[model samples]
Target chain A: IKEEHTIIQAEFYLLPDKRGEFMFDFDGDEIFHVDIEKSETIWRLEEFAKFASFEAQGALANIAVDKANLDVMKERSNNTPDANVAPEVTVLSRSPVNLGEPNILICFIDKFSPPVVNVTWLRNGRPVTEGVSETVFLPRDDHLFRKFHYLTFLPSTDDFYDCEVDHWGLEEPLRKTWEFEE
Target chain B: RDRMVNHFIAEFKRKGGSLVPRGSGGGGSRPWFLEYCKSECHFYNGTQRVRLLVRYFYNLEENLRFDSDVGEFRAVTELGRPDAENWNSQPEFLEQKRAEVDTVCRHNYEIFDNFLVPRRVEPTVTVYPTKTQPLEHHNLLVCSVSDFYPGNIEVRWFRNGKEEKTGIVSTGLVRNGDWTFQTLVMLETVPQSGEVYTCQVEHPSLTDPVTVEW
Candidate 1:
C-alpha cells in the first residue's frame, strides 16, 4: 500500500520429505524457492532470479531457520513415550475436474499429534514427488495438528492417485485413494 | 517390555487428621485453617525411576507441593506462593522428602509384584474392497484388524497362497482408548477375474493367526 510497505510469505511442510516444496514470495510474487535435486541444478527462482544479489541471500537464509526448527522438533518428538493419536484423512479436488482438464488434488490430514508425520502420494502404485505443494504444520483448537498437501495433474480414468501417511503412533501408514465415479 | 506388566497389586490407606493455627494479621489475631496432606508414589517397570508428590491443599483450589527432588516448597497457585518463597531457600527438607523414594515407593513396589496374573484379548478381522460396487477395473483390498489388546501386531496379503511383498500399505497401531488397539492393511492391485486375495493377521492375543478372504 505504501513505498516502504513490503510483504514476504513462506511455507515449509513437515515430514521426512526434505527440501520439500518451499517458496518465498515478495509482494505476492514468487522470489525464490528452496529446492535441490539429484542433478546439477540448485534453487528455484522466479522473475527475481534475475535481480541483483540484493536481499536474496537474506531472504534465502530464512530457509535455514525454518529447516533448523523442523529438525529440532523432529528429534524432540522422537524420544517421546510414543504418545500418539491416529490421523483422519480426506481427499477431493480443489476445483471440479472437468474431464482431462487440470485440477488440484488436495489431501487433508487431520487430528494427528506430536506433529511428526510423513505423507506420500502414489499414482498407480508408484511414488510421485514432482509438482507437489504442501503447508507447514497447523494446530487446531485441541492439542492435535493438521496439514494439507496438494497434487496438480490431468485426471484420466487410467490414473488412480493415493495419499499415504506415515506416523510414529500408527501400527502402519494410512493410505487414501482418490478417483471419482463416471 | 512395551508388552505387558505381567502382574500388579496395590493397597491404599487414607489418613484423616488436621490442625488449627492462630496467627497475627491486620493488628488482630487470625486463624489459618490447616487441612489435608496427601502423598503418592510412582514407579516404572523399566530403569525403575521412583518418585512422589507431597501435595497439601487449602481453600480446596490453590494448593502447595513440598517437592522431594527440589527439596523445597512449590506452589501450584498464587495462595501457596507465600510459603514457597519462605521455604524454597533450603533442603533436610530434602532428606525428609528424598527418603520417601526408598522407604515408601520401593517398599510398596516390593509388596505389589508378588500378586500377578497375565491378561489377553483377541482381535477381530474384516476384509473388504475399496470404492463403491461396480465402479472400475482396479480395486484395493482393505483388511481391518480391531479389538485387540497389546498393541504389537502383523498383517499380510496373499494371492492364491502366494504372499504379496509390494504395494501393501498399513496403519500404525491405533488405540481404541479402551485398553484395546486397532490397525488395517491395504493391498493395491488390478485383479484377474479368477484369482483370490486373502488377508492374514498375527497378534500375541491369538493362539493362531486369523485370515480373511476378499
Candidate 2:
C-alpha cells in the first residue's frame, strides 16, 4: 500500500544580521540542511545546491536570498495582526489500529490566528478533569498558532471522549470526539 | 532501465545537484531527472562497465565528466582551477565531493517524498529537558516530532499562550531509516512554577496540529 507523505521545511535566519539557513524534512523527520556561511562548508559554498538536479536549483537557491530579505521585511513591518482565527481541531489515538492498549488521546488544534487557546476534556457526558494536559500556544511562521491537549485513559468500548477548544479567533468553541472501537 | 535511472539520480545527488520533476504538478508530484550520464568503471571480469544515467534538467549549464576507470572527475564550466588530479585520492577533493553529496541529499528530500511508502504514518510528539543547563536556574525544553513520512511539518513554540520567538533552536528536519522524518525544537527558559511551554507541530497527515506541553 502507498503511504501518505508530506514534506515540511523552512529557510530562516539564525542571527539578527540575517545569516541564511535552509532545512527540509520528509514526513516528520529532518533530512538535510544548507548552511552556506558555516565554516565547514565556507570554502565551496557557492555550489551548495548543485546536486539538487535542475528543476529545484532555482527554488532552492532563492530560499537563501529570500530568507535574508524576508527577515528584513518582517522586522520592518513589526506588526503581528490580531485577527481571530479558529483552530482546526481533531482527535487522534496513539494506538489507532488496536483496541486492547491503554488509549492516549491527543486533541490537536491547528492554524488559528492570534495565539490564545483553551481546551477541555470530557468522558461520556461528564467533564474529565484529571489526567488531562493541554499545551501552550505555539506560533507559526505566518504568525498563526497551534496547540495539542492530551488525555490518557483506559478504554471501554462503550465510551466516547470529547475535546473542546476555545480560541480567541473563533466565534464559538470547537469540539472533536474519539470513541473506543473494534 | 529502472535501476540505471535510479543510479543516475543517486549519482547526481551524490554530486550536489537538486533534481525535481519535469513539470510542476506541485510539491506532491513525483520527481525525476531529464538527462543521464554514461560512465564506465572497470573492476572485475575484464573492464566491468557502469552507465550512470542522470535525469537532466534544461537549466543546468555545465557539462561535466567523470572517468570512473581513472577516477578522474572534472567540470568544464570552471576557470584556472586545475582538473582534479587523481581526484579520488585527494582528501580535499574527496571532501568537496562529500559535501556535494550531502548538499544534494539534504536539498532534494522532496524528490523522495513522491515515492510510494507505507500509508498514513502519523507523528509522535514529546517534550523533555536537556541537562546542559541547570533545571532550576535555566531549563531547556526539547520538543521532538517523530515517526512520520513525506516530511511536511511545521513546529513552533509558545510560552503562556504567547508566541515565544527567541532562544529557540531546531534540528532542522531529518529522516529515519524507515523513511520517516523527525525534528527537535529546543527552547531555553527559566523554570517557573506557573509558566507553560508548548511545542506545536503542523503536518498534512493530521487534520490539526499536535502540541506537547511542559
TM values, all candidates: 0.34, 0.31
The positional error of residue B175 in candidate 1, measured at the CA in angstroms, is 1.6
Residue A100, candidate 2: C-alpha displacement in angstroms? 22
Assess the local accuracy of residue A92 in candidate 1 as a C-alpha lDDT between 0 and 100: 63
lDDT of 1 by residue, A11-35 (tens): 3333333442233222222323434
lDDT of each prediction vs. the true structure? 0.52, 0.48
Indicate which candidate wins on lDDT: 1
- What C-alpha lDDT, on a 0 to 100 scale, does residue B151 get in candidate 2? 72
* Candidate 2: CAPRI quality band: incorrect
Q: What TM-score does prediction 1 earn?
A: 0.34
Off by over 4 Å in 2: A1-182, B1-120, B131-137
Task: Give candidate 1 regions above 4 Å deviation.
Answer: A1-182, B1-90, B93-117, B134-137
Per-candidate iRMSD: 28.3, 18.9
